[PDB]
């Protein structure tokens, strides 16, 4: 399941976008629209293990977050993204899952959607492709998070 | 709109 949860200034998901078709059944049962980030994200994790996409013994959930400037003030989003990161891992602790959080950029966000990937899948795709791990966009469409992360572990060659 | 959280499972 590749999901994009678009939140507003009050951390609630205004709209949820499936970047991959397997996310659609998850979002259906989750219903994260009009839901605060904590419960919404918890639903995505909860519903995915119930549908058998992940098992609780090995579930690395990837979280990537970018602040697409609809709020900024002057120095808000710097510490604001930290409020995001702390919630992403807190929900991962809630669900009892393992996590990898790679913060995304707005530039990265539009690259992700152009590759037909979620920012999570893409953030680690772009990591792996730099590491010398040969990933195709089709491999990124298909291979699991645990497969992509596992390849970084045994073959790490770049920053 | 503020942030996009893209979550990858499986």
Curated annotation (Swiss-Prot), chain A:
It comes from the Bacteria. The keyword NADP does not apply. One of its GO terms (biological process) is carbohydrate metabolic process. Keywords: Calcium, Cell membrane, Membrane, Metal-binding, Transmembrane, Transmembrane helix. Signal peptide: none annotated. One of its GO terms (molecular function) is cellulose binding. It is found in: Cell membrane. Its main location: membrane. Disulfide bonds: none annotated. Interacts (via RsgI N-terminal anti-sigma domain) with SigI2. Anti-sigma factor for SigI2. Negatively regulates SigI2 activity through direct interaction. Binding of the polysaccharide substrate to the extracellular C-terminal sensing domain of RsgI2 may induce a conformational change in its N-terminal cytoplasmic region, leading to the release and activation of SigI2. This is Anti-sigma-I factor RsgI2. The gene is rsgI2. The chain holds residues 98 to 248 of 671 of the full protein.
